[PDB]
Coordinates of C-alpha atoms in Angstrom, one line a residue:
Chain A
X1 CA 131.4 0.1 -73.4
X2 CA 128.4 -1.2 -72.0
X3 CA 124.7 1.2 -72.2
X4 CA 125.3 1.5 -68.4
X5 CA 128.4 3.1 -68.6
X6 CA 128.0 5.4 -71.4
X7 CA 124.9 6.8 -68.6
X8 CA 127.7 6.8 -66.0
X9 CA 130.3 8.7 -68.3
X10 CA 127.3 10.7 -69.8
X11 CA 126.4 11.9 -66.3
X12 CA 130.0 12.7 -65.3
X13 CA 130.4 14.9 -68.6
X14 CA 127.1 16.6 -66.8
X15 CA 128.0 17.3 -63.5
X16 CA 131.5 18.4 -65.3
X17 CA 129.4 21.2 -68.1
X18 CA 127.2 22.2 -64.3
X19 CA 130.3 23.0 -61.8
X20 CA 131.6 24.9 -64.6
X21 CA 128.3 27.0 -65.2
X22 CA 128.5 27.1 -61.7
X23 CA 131.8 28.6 -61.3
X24 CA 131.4 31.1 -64.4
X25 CA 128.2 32.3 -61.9
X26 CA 130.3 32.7 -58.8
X27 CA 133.0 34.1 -60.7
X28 CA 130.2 37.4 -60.9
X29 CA 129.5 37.2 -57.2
X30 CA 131.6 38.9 -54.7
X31 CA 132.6 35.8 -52.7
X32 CA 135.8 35.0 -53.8
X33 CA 136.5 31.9 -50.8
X34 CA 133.1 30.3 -52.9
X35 CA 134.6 31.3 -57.0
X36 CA 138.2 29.7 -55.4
X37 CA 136.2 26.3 -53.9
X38 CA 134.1 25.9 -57.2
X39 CA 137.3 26.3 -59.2
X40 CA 138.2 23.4 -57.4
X41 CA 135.6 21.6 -57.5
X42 CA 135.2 22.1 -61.5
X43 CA 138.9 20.7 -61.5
X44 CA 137.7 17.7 -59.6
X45 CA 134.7 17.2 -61.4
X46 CA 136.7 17.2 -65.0
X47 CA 139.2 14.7 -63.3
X48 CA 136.3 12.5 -62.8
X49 CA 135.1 12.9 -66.3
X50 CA 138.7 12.1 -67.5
X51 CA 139.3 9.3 -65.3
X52 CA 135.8 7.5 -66.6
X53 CA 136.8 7.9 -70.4
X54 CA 139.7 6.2 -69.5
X55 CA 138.4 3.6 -67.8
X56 CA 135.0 2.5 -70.0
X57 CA 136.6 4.0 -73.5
Chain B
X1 CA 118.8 37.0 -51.4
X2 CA 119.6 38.4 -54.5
X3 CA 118.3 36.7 -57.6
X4 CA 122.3 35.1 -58.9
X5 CA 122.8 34.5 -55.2
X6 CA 119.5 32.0 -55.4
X7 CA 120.6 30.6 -58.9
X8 CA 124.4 30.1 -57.3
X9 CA 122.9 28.5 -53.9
X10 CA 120.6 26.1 -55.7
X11 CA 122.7 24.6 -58.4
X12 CA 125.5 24.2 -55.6
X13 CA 122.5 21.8 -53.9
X14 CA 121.7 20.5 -57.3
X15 CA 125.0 19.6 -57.9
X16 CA 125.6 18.5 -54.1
X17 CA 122.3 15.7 -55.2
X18 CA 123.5 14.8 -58.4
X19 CA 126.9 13.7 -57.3
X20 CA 125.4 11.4 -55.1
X21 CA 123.2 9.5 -58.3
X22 CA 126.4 9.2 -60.2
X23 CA 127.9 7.5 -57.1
X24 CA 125.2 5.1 -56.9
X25 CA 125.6 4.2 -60.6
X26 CA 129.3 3.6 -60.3
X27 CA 128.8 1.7 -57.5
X28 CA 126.8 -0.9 -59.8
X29 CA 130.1 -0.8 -62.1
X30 CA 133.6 -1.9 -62.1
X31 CA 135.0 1.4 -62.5
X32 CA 136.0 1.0 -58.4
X33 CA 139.0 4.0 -58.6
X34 CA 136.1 6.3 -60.7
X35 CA 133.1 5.6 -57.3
X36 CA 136.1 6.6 -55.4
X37 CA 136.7 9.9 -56.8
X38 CA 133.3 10.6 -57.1
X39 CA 132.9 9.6 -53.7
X40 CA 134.8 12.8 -53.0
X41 CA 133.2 14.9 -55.4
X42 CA 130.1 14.5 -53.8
X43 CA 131.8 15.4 -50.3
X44 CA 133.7 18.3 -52.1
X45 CA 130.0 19.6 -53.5
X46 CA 128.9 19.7 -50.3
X47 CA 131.7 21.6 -49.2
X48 CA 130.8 24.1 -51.7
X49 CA 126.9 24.0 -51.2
X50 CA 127.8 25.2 -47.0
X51 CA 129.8 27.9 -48.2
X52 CA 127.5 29.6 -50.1
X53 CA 124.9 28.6 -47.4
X54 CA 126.6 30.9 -45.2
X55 CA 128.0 33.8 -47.4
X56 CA 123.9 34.0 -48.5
X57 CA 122.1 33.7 -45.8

């Protein structure tokens, strides 16, 4: 792959590592409508992740 | 606020920004179907960053 997408896929293994420190935070916190929307989120997050290894490895 | 309900709020509007600078750096790549889904993502994050808006404040 090229330098500019390892950054991309880099970045997308980020944002996939933050929604889940996210969601283990929420998961502490009494809202359970904002722990069930970062759950999903996280999910979407690692689809993205999965879906740019696939694509530039 | 308490101090895990600032932590939580924050890195919901840190990941809310961050989504949209991996958009912009698919968009400079031919990984069309992965800008797409991240695209989303970003929406999704914003989703997430209202909800905790108004469950904290």
């Amino acid at each position: 792959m090229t330098k500019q997408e390892k950054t991309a896929l880099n970045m997308a293994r980020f944002i996939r590592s933050q929604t889940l420190t996210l969601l283990e935070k929420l998961n502490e916190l009494p809202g359970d409508e904002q722990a069930d929307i970062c759950e999903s989120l996280h999910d979407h997050a690692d689809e993205l992740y999965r879906s740019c290894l696939a694509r530039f490895g």
